[PDB]
């Protein structure tokens, strides 16, 4: 499904074609070279990375896009996909 709220502050990673025995400390500290990672967490064939700043994350990924991990390459791409943009109205 889809989260809902596009507007957001931190950023989301995901990441496909993972190895059977990738652990999270391989995988979030691969990622945290390019920033301070949030929460990293492993699937079956793919990934999850939660980034704290964009400029980290959109880095992460054209760096990790397509890079033989574990043995195997991953396909790493924005988790959530954001079409419209909003700034944020008052709510008081």
Not at 14 to 26: A, D, K, R
Not at 55 to 83: C, P, W, Y
Request: charge should be negative.
């Amino acid at each position: 499904g889809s989260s809902g709220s596009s507007g957001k502050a931190s950023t989301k990673l995901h990441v496909g074609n993972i190895s059977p025995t990738c652990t999270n400390q391989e995988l979030r500290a691969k990622f945290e070279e390019y920033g301070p990672v949030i929460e990293c967490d492993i699937v079956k064939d793919y990934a999850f990375v939660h980034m704290e700043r964009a400029e980290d994350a959109v880095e992460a990924i054209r760096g990790l896009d397509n890079t033989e991990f574990q043995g195997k390459r991953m396909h790493v791409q924005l988790s959530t996909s954001r079409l419209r943009t909003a700034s944020g109205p008052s709510s008081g």
